[PDB]
Design a protein around this nucleic acid. Structure first.
Ligand SMILES: [Mg+2]
Ligand SMILES: [Mg+2]
Ligand SMILES: [Mg+2]
Ligand SMILES: [Mg+2]
Ligand SMILES: [Mg+2]
Ligand SMILES: [Mg+2]
Ligand SMILES: [Mg+2]
Ligand SMILES: [Mg+2]
Ligand SMILES: [Mg+2]
Ligand SMILES: [Mg+2]
Ligand SMILES: [Mg+2]
Ligand SMILES: [Mg+2]
Ligand SMILES: [Mg+2]
Ligand SMILES: [Mg+2]
Ligand SMILES: [Mg+2]
Ligand SMILES: [Mg+2]
Ligand SMILES: [Mg+2]
Ligand SMILES: [Mg+2]
Ligand SMILES: [Mg+2]
Ligand SMILES: [Mg+2]
Ligand SMILES: [Mg+2]
Ligand SMILES: [Mg+2]
Ligand SMILES: [Mg+2]
Ligand SMILES: [Mg+2]
Ligand SMILES: [Mg+2]
Ligand SMILES: [Mg+2]
Ligand SMILES: [Mg+2]
Ligand SMILES: [Mg+2]
Ligand SMILES: [Mg+2]
Ligand SMILES: [Mg+2]
Ligand SMILES: [Mg+2]
Ligand SMILES: [Mg+2]
Ligand SMILES: [Mg+2]
Ligand SMILES: [Mg+2]
Ligand SMILES: [Mg+2]
Ligand SMILES: [Mg+2]
Ligand SMILES: [Mg+2]
Ligand SMILES: [Mg+2]
Ligand SMILES: [Mg+2]
Ligand SMILES: [Mg+2]
Ligand SMILES: [Mg+2]
Ligand SMILES: [Mg+2]
Ligand SMILES: [Mg+2]
Ligand SMILES: [Mg+2]
Ligand SMILES: [Mg+2]
Ligand SMILES: [Mg+2]
Ligand SMILES: [Mg+2]
Ligand SMILES: [Mg+2]
Ligand SMILES: [Mg+2]
Ligand SMILES: [Mg+2]
Ligand SMILES: [Mg+2]
Ligand SMILES: [Mg+2]
Ligand SMILES: [Mg+2]
Ligand SMILES: [Mg+2]
Ligand SMILES: [Mg+2]
Ligand SMILES: [Mg+2]
Ligand SMILES: [Mg+2]
Ligand SMILES: [Mg+2]
Ligand SMILES: [Mg+2]
Ligand SMILES: [Mg+2]
Ligand SMILES: [Mg+2]
Ligand SMILES: [Mg+2]
Ligand SMILES: [Mg+2]
Ligand SMILES: [Mg+2]
Ligand SMILES: [Zn+2]
Lengths: 258, 60, 206
RNA sequence: AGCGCCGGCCAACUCCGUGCCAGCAGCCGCGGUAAUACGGAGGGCGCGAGCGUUACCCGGAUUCACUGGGCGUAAAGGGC
RNA sequence: UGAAACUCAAAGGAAUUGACGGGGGCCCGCACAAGCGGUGGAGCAUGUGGUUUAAUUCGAAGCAACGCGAAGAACCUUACCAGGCCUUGACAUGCUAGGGAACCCGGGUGAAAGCCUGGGGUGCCCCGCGAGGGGAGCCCUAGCACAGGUGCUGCAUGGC
RNA sequence: GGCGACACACGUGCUACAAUGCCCACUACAAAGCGAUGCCACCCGGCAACGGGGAGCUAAUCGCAAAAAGGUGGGCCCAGUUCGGAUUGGGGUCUGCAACCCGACCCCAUGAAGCCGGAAUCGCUAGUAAUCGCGGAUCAGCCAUGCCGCGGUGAAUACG
RNA sequence: CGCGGGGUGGAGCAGCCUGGUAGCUCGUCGGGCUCAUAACCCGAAGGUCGUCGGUUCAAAUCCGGCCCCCGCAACCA
RNA sequence: AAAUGUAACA
């Protein structure tokens, strides 16, 4: 067997630790019930590879489960392996919240993102500052007319300007101007960072929450079918109540050939 | 693993402990009555038909 | 799912065993097994004849099998052709003196196991199950029975949703011990699945 | 020699594929591994140098009622 | 006084059969009350949820699953796991072609299975004082149909 | 090898926490069943499990077999005990090819929790509950305190 | 930069002044009730007392230094 | 004087 050289495409965040959050979808507390069923399944899979799965936020279901649950799975090759869980996972089963006894198609959603801890990037490098000392405006005396002590700083890379003209001395007026300039630098960068979070999650969790990508988990028949590729096994319980390595693997093998 | 098991149960074993009764009618290994060679289910099925001599519904 | 089997409920009151003999603790099983094998062979070979009851007797090394049937000729053959062929197939399996008799079923339309097998045949021929059941009951009542009830359960007509269809006429007092009720069951194998057929004939009370 | 159609209305039914997907849809509704309702095939029905679709007009609509409707509770007696 | 856009395949009247009511009436059941003994706590036995595991096979899920299928799991059972093995196969009905049939007895290797072998005489109706020539009693080897599956669906079913 | 795992959780039960009791000795009174590689009298060896002898019985004949509570007599004296019998050490018996995982029994030693049980909850209306033993199916043996039967002793209470 | 108030379980607050003992509510957890959830009932776990030093036999408590938080002041030209 | 039970009946 001539092993095809798979050492041509590189990957940055392929071995980094990954955040994994599961959110309930269509179907009330039934999808919340299943979001725990997906989370235990990823918990069985993380511990089966000696990984550190650590929950950071959860919202319990009305009758048991998880409306939301975000966890940090740490280890070797975490994101490069679970990055095919991002999307909408469909369910078809006889609910535990059923009154009559009919199949109900609920759905859940999973988000998988790398680590890349946010940096500080602070203490405002001056080489990007243009300090402007001029005269104040308003009440005072001869001191206002003569003594300047009106300050305005300008951060060139971002364009954020701030001027402070409260107390008399410009040094106590520059101190407030410096701290506010950095406060606007950080609030503006923290904007551009969380804008990148809600823009990537929106195109990964699928706004539609009943008919979208990934797998459908049918319990009456026993069919775990992943629609991305073209393989429908019958593990179900084995994959769910345990790990699922040989299911991600046919997805990676086809994605390689892509 | 069924017909092979109703067969292996017939052949005499390597050691006399390994012998065990199977229901001669349906092949059941559990709840086999020695007196009849039948399991509790077949015992009931034939008895209701009347194909067990002298056997009848017991009431007291 | 409740009702008791109507024959086993009347054993030794209105209905008599089909294997009448005595045997001791050490022997009972082997006689019973051979008894069922006799029925096994005969149930297959004698089906076309109209097999209703298979009585069996035993004394010591000799056994007498009395076959009740609607078409005695189909059993006997031409001057004894098949009747002789049977004893050889028989006493080969038996390994002992296997006396084989035949006896008439005076009214096959008053024999519940016969009525049951007829409807089962009708529904393997893709006949209208409900029309058949009303007919079967109509035959049994014309033949003089005091009451009749016939039941068919399964994928009736091929339908995906299983159902139970029955029809009845006259009296069928399944709770009365002294009421003589013949009972019979017939399995109808189709392309879509198995249908169960139950026939109750109330001949009269004793 | 072609085009529409074959769940009901409405004339014409089966096999396979698919498996709330892909799709159909005029209304009611079809599709979640035995679908006459989706796609192909065989067969069938209807028209034929045409056959279907969209748009628009009258009809069916006694559903603006002159012919020919209604108003206690269905829409509908004005507060007197 | 009084629209429209948009949207739905209904919104409705009366009457019928149920079901329900923190509606009524009249009744019944160890249903309560009246009583007596327990469970829930302890230690243990057992079934189950879980978790663990190579596997801890499977089913049962409020009453009506949980000493239930299990009226007997050390091997067997056993359906799971690991490892060693077999390929018309542990089992049925077949046709075809080679051996000798059939049955019993040991040897080698091995945890055993298996793999490898060394033993020994086949009736029949038959040409048989003769090598020799079978049929099919049964096995053995090669093959082709087929077997086998406690694999899924009790939401396709019969039966119970 | 696993179904017998074990931070935990629930159901069903067993034995108990003691004096209307426990122990030892002697002595009575059942039913329903089961039993020929089966039930075993009686004898002997062993503290014993059991072993070696050996009669009977195809069983209303012979055997399991003693029923237990009870009765009579003695000991205990209110204490975690002469209550309770978990846990563990050591020594054996039997079944079985084989009792490491994973059998039952006997003996010596050990002698835990448990002082009558939170919220809650189960059964039973008379030979019933309670309590006491005996048998059987399955079965080599047995994890049976389970199940299906059998008799012994034998209540309380029901206004409504 | 001044003045004075604070940091104590997951959340919100006590306990300091007159040093030895950290408590209340919610929450969390196991068990109940219910067909099930909530409510309700029973039982339980949970606190480097912001950090660094010290007075003491002994510091959440008393005394200094740093780190955050809250409030006030920053006037006359 | 005591709240709730979505979403796929042949
Ligand atoms: Mg959220
Ligand atoms: Mg100004
Ligand atoms: Mg100046
Ligand atoms: Mg100046
Ligand atoms: Mg297998
Ligand atoms: Mg089978
Ligand atoms: Mg055995
Ligand atoms: Mg058995
Ligand atoms: Mg047309
Ligand atoms: Mg249809
Ligand atoms: Mg038309
Ligand atoms: Mg038509
Ligand atoms: Mg598709
Ligand atoms: Mg279907
Ligand atoms: Mg299909
Ligand atoms: Mg079609
Ligand atoms: Mg159509
Ligand atoms: Mg023309
Ligand atoms: Mg045209
Ligand atoms: Mg019009
Ligand atoms: Mg008009
Ligand atoms: Mg008019
Ligand atoms: Mg009108
Ligand atoms: Mg109105
Ligand atoms: Mg109205
Ligand atoms: Mg008026
Ligand atoms: Mg008005
Ligand atoms: Mg109405
Ligand atoms: Mg009404
Ligand atoms: Mg009522
Ligand atoms: Mg009660
Ligand atoms: Mg009563
Ligand atoms: Mg009570
Ligand atoms: Mg208790
Ligand atoms: Mg307990
Ligand atoms: Mg299971
Ligand atoms: Mg199954
Ligand atoms: Mg189970
Ligand atoms: Mg129950
Ligand atoms: Mg095994
Ligand atoms: Mg095996
Ligand atoms: Mg089921
Ligand atoms: Mg059913
Ligand atoms: Mg059924
Ligand atoms: Mg084992
Ligand atoms: Mg088990
Ligand atoms: Mg264990
Ligand atoms: Mg507990
Ligand atoms: Mg208990
Ligand atoms: Mg128990
Ligand atoms: Mg003691
Ligand atoms: Mg002690
Ligand atoms: Mg005491
Ligand atoms: Mg209570
Ligand atoms: Mg007791
Ligand atoms: Mg036994
Ligand atoms: Mg044990
Ligand atoms: Mg017992
Ligand atoms: Mg306060
Ligand atoms: Mg405070
Ligand atoms: Mg709790
Ligand atoms: Mg300090
Ligand atoms: Mg202290
Ligand atoms: Mg002033
Ligand atoms: Zn059986």
């Amino acid at each position: 067997q001539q092993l095809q050289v798979l050492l041509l495409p590189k990957d940055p965040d392929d071995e980094r630790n990954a955040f994994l959050e599961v959110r309930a979808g269509t179907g009330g507390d039934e999808a919340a019930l299943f979001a725990g069923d997906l989370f235990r399944m990823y918990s069985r899979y993380a511990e089966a590879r000696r990984w550190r799965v650590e929950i950071m936020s959860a919202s319990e279901g009305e009758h048991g489960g998880y409306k939301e649950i975000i966890a940090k799975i740490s280890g070797d090759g975490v994101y490069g392996r679970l990055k095919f869980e991002s999307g909408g996972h469909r369910v078809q089963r006889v609910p535990a919240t059923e009154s009559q006894g009919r199949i109900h198609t609920s759905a859940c959603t999973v988000a998988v993102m790398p680590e890349l801890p946010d940096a500080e990037l602070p203490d405002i490098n001056p080489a990007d500052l243009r300090i402007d000392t001029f005269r104040s405006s308003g009440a005072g005396g001869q001191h206002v007319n003569t003594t300047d002590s009106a300050i305005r700083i300008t951060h060139l890379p971002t364009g954020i300007v701030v001027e402070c003209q409260d107390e008399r001395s410009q040094h106590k007026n520059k101190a407030k101007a410096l701290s506010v300039l950095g406060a606007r630098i950080h609030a503006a960068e923290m904007a551009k960072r969380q804008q990148a979070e809600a823009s990537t999650r929106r195109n990964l969790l699928g706004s539609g929450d009943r008919s979208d990508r990934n797998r459908t988990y049918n319990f009456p028949q026993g069919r775990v079918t992943d629609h991305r590729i073209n393989l429908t096994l019958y593990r179900l319980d084995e994959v769910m109540e345990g790990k699922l390595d040989m299911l991600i693997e046919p997805i990676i093998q086809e994605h390689q050939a892509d | 693993a069924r017909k092979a098991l109703i067969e292996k149960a017939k052949r005499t074993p390597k050691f006399k402990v390994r012998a065990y009764t199977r229901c001669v009618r349906c092949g059941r290994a559990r709840s086999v009555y020695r007196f009849f060679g039948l399991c509790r289910i077949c015992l009931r099925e034939l008895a209701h038909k009347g194909q067990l001599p002298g056997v009848r519904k017991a009431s007291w | 799912g409740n009702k008791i089997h109507p024959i086993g409920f009347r054993l030794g009151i209105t209905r008599d065993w089909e294997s009448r003999w005595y045997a001791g603790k050490k022997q009972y099983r082997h006689l019973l097994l051979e008894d069922q094998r006799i029925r096994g062979l005969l149930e297959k070979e004698l089906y076309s004849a109209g097999l209703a009851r298979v009585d069996i007797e035993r004394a010591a090394d000799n056994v007498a099998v009395t076959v009740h049937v609607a078409k005695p000729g189909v059993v006997i053959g031409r001057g004894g052709e098949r009747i002789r062929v049977l004893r050889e197939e028989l006493a080969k399996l038996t390994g002992k003196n296997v006396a084989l008799n035949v006896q008439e079923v005076q009214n096959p339309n008053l024999s519940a196991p016969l009525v049951a097998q007829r409807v089962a045949e009708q529904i393997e021929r893709r006949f209208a199950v409900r029309r058949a059941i009303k007919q079967a009951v109509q035959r049994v009542m014309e033949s003089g029975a005091k009451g009749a009830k016939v039941i068919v359960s399964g994928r009736i007509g091929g339908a995906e949703q299983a159902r139970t269809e029955w029809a009845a006429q006259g009296r069928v007092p399944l709770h009365t011990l002294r009421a003589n009720i013949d009972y019979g069951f017939a399995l109808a194998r189709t392309t879509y699945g198995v249908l169960g057929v139950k026939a109750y004939i109330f001949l009269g009370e004793v």
